[PDB]
Amino acid sequence: KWKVFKKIEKKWKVFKKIEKAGPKWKVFKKIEK
């Protein structure tokens, strides 16, 4: 069901909202760089 991607779409645009409130989901990747 391609409709499931809609949840993935709002999962990204919504995840970027927390990045400004706490990008702790990307700080762990900073070590890889």
Side-chain angles (χ1 to χ4, degrees), residues 2-32:
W2 180 273
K3 326 220 72 97
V4 309
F5 258 71
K6 219 149 145 239
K7 256 160 74 214
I8 286 190
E9 220 132 284
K10 305 250 203 169
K11 190 136 243 174
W12 193 41
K13 177 71 221 81
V14 73
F15 249 54
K16 240 243 285 191
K17 180 137 142 164
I18 182 163
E19 187 198 340
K20 276 129 130 168
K24 187 166 55 65
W25 284 58
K26 291 268 203 240
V27 303
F28 256 133
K29 214 181 167 216
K30 231 278 229 194
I31 66 91
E32 199 224 20

